[PDB]
């Protein structure tokens, strides 16, 4: 499941500590990322720490709970969105969306660049606003495996925007630990 060692170019040997190697690989280029303000949303290390700590994003964006069609009820300085599920279930409403964040841009084949509009088919776990989705929302909506995929995606996006070349497998080694435990409901 780990695959080959990047250093040797062959299947990783039994007993080799991939965890410490992944931690060092991620941390070593850390100084190349944009840092927090020392003058005392910019990306880089401040967001990486945000992703690995599973904190609620400051620039949070809501995500679609159900797949369906969007009915948009814009207000003077706020947005309201309703999703009519294609399954015929209960309509889902987001009610206090700000206009400081701009509405999601789609980039689908139906054009080259465009924003969410009435009648657009929105999938499960699809974001409605520009920003960052809350990983806990992804967990309750899309599930654990999709949360791990999302976390790896976001971290590697942050690194790619900064011109760093960490292989995804180290990020996956780290993220596997973030979702290693279950809370028990009934004994």
């Amino acid at each position: 499941c780990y695959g080959r060692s990047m250093a040797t170019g062959k299947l990783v040997d039994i007993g080799e500590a991939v965890g410490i190697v992944a931690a060092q690989s991620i941390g070593e280029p850390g100084t190349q990322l944009t840092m927090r303000t020392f003058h005392q949303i910019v990306g880089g290390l401040p967001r990486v720490q945000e992703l690995f700590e599973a904190r609620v994003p400051r620039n949070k964006a809501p995500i679609a709970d159900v797949a369906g069609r969007v009915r948009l009820e814009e207000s003077d300085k706020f947005f309201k969105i309703t999703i009519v599920p294609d399954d015929g279930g209960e309509e889902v409403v987001y009610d206090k969306l700000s206009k400081r964040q701009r509405l999601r841009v789609i980039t689908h084949e139906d054009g080259t660049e465009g924003v969410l509009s009435d009648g657009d088919h929105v999938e499960v776990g699809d974001q409605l606003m520009e920003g960052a989705a809350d990983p806990h929302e992804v967990l309750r909506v899309q599930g654990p495996r999709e949360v791990q995929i999302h976390l790896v995606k976001e971290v590697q996006e942050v690194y790619r925007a900064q011109g760093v070349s960490i292989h995804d497998k180290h990020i996956e080694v780290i993220v596997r630990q973030m979702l290693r435990r279950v809370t028990i409901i009934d004994s």
Binding site: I20, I26, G27, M35, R36, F38, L45, F52
Partner: protein, 146 residues
């Protein structure tokens, strides 16, 4: 002799100085804010820096040592070459804001006294904050290891 200066520099600088004078006229006319004047001047001088960079890159012979080291991928980058023989460009004040008036001199020509003084700010900022950058990186690495 190898540090070539592109002949187009002065024409570009005069054009952008005319643009800056136009903005000065508009500001003195009450049509523009102080902060917005700073914004516009910063953007114009960024355009000037890009123009001078292109002129320098097209003027240098392919086999000149200074451009040879950069283009060979041995070390350095075109930004350092533009700073060396083009113009230093805009520099930040202690608050991190760009100072609207750029350093039009290059290190080949040698900066004037005030250009050098305003240059020292970002230099000391970089010298001072490096330990904090290293500490943040080390902290993240430590948590990942743990």
């Amino acid at each position: 002799a190898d540090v070539l200066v592109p002949p187009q520099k002065q024409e570009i600088l005069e054009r952008h100085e005319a643009e800056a004078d136009a903005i000065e006229r508009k500001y003195q006319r009450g049509a523009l804010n102080h902060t917005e004047r700073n914004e516009s001047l910063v953007k114009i001088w960024q355009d000037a820096t890009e123009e001078v960079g292109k002129a320098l890159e097209e003027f240098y012979p392919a086999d000149n040592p200074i451009i040879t080291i950069v283009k060979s991928g041995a070390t350095g980058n075109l930004t350092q070459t533009r700073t060396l023989a083009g113009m230093k460009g805009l520099v930040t004040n202690p608050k991190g804001e760009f100072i609207p008036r750029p350093i039009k001199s290059s290190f080949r020509e040698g900066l004037t006294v005030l250009e050098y003084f305003i240059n020292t700010h970002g230099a000391r900022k970089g010298l001072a904050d490096t330990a904090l950058r290293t500490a943040d990186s080390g902290y993240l690495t430590r948590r990942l290891v743990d």
